[PDB]
């Protein structure tokens, strides 16, 4: 219980910090000539941060 609470408390702090103080992106049409990046293709800020800073893009592996 101690070591699941010591995990949950920074995790729940990061989840409310991501949803409340940053918030998810809004879906919109692609503007002409933008050529968007890979981390633009996801909605949640944690998913965007993971796809930008940690995980490799699909284009690179492809």
């Amino acid at each position: 219980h101690f070591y699941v609470m010591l995990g949950v408390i920074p995790v729940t702090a990061l989840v409310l910090y991501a949803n409340i103080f940053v918030g998810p992106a809004q879906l919109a049409e692609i503007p002409e000539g933008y050529e968007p990046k890979h981390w633009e293709y996801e909605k949640h800020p944690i998913s965007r941060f993971i796809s930008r800073y940690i995980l490799n893009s699909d284009q690179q592996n492809y």
């Binding site: 219980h1 101690f2 609470m5 010591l6 408390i9 879906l27 919109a28 049409e29 909605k43």
Partner: protein, 161 residues
């Protein structure tokens, strides 16, 4: 050194007299005295004392951190209703708060962040048509949705694309 048994030698004491069939085939009177002494030893006069070291080791500091204000609520009501009637109203206050917190969180999740067409893993809510009897507004009533695209849209009809 690590002692798994508390420093005393573990052994059986009551012997062969714990079985009911071995008790009936025959007893020497020293075994009768040993069984009588074991039965007088197995009785307890007073209950277990409140060891504070067991409460210290069997409670993490996070548990005390999230149980401290309700413990203060139970302690300020301790001489008013006794120990038994204040721990009950303490235990049914935090649990009722947890139940209302879960109800409010589930209500917020299922009506403000339900599953839409852009995500698979959410809870996809489908509702049936309510029965309309006279005395309600608009009793001559047909199905409002008739198009195939209106069925199971999951918010696709308000898409910006």
């Amino acid at each position: 050194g690590a002692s798994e048994t508390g420093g005393v030698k573990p052994m059986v004491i009551a012997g062969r007299m714990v079985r009911e069939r071995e008790r009936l085939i025959g007893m020497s009177p020293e075994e009768r005295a040993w069984r009588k002494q074991w039965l007088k030893d197995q009785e307890l006069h007073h209950g277990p004392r409140k060891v504070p070291a067991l409460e210290l080791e069997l409670n993490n500091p996070i548990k005390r951190f999230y149980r401290a204000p309700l413990d203060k609520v139970c302690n300020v009501l301790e001489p008013v209703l006794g120990f038994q009637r204040a721990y009950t109203v303490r235990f049914w206050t935090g649990k009722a708060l947890l139940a209302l917190t879960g109800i409010y969180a589930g209500a917020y999740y299922f009506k403000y962040n339900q599953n839409d067409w852009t995500r698979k893993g959410g809870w996809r809510v489908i509702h049936s048509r309510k029965q309309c009897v006279p005395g309600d507004e608009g009793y001559p009533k047909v199905s409002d949705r008739s198009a195939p695209s209106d069925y199971a849209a999951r918010g696709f009809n308000e898409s910006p694309l």
